[PDB]
């Protein structure tokens, strides 16, 4: 049904696909929800910690590593097999 995807039944996945309407909310709506879900939970408190930014920085680092794989494995490989 309209419940969260982590709560929908396994056999109800095609049913929830029909319920996926308005979940993107023109794509941008889902991003609008997702930004505030994290921001209002780990940042917008009376007193936060360094954990607010470290997740984003680590995600940025891993995303950057994903791009350059082509060149690295191209020749930087040490051994064979």
């Amino acid at each position: 049904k309209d419940r969260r995807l982590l709560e929908v039944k396994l056999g109800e996945l095609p049913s929830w696909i029909l319920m996926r309407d308005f979940t993107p909310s023109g794509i941008a709506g889902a991003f609008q929800r997702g930004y505030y879900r994290y921001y209002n939970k780990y940042v917008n408190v009376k007193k936060g910690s360094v954990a607010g930014l470290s997740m984003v920085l680590a995600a940025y680092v891993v995303f950057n590593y994903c791009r350059s794989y082509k060149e690295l494995k191209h020749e930087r490989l040490r051994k064979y097999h």
Partner: protein
Amino acid sequence: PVPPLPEHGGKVRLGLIPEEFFQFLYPKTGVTGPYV
């Protein structure tokens, strides 16, 4: 008239991994499961 903010957010182990992942695998993996 914005309501007051909560005093705390969430608890994170090692400063990078939240506690919810540890709680999720606790019944099956155990206390020391996910580190392995």
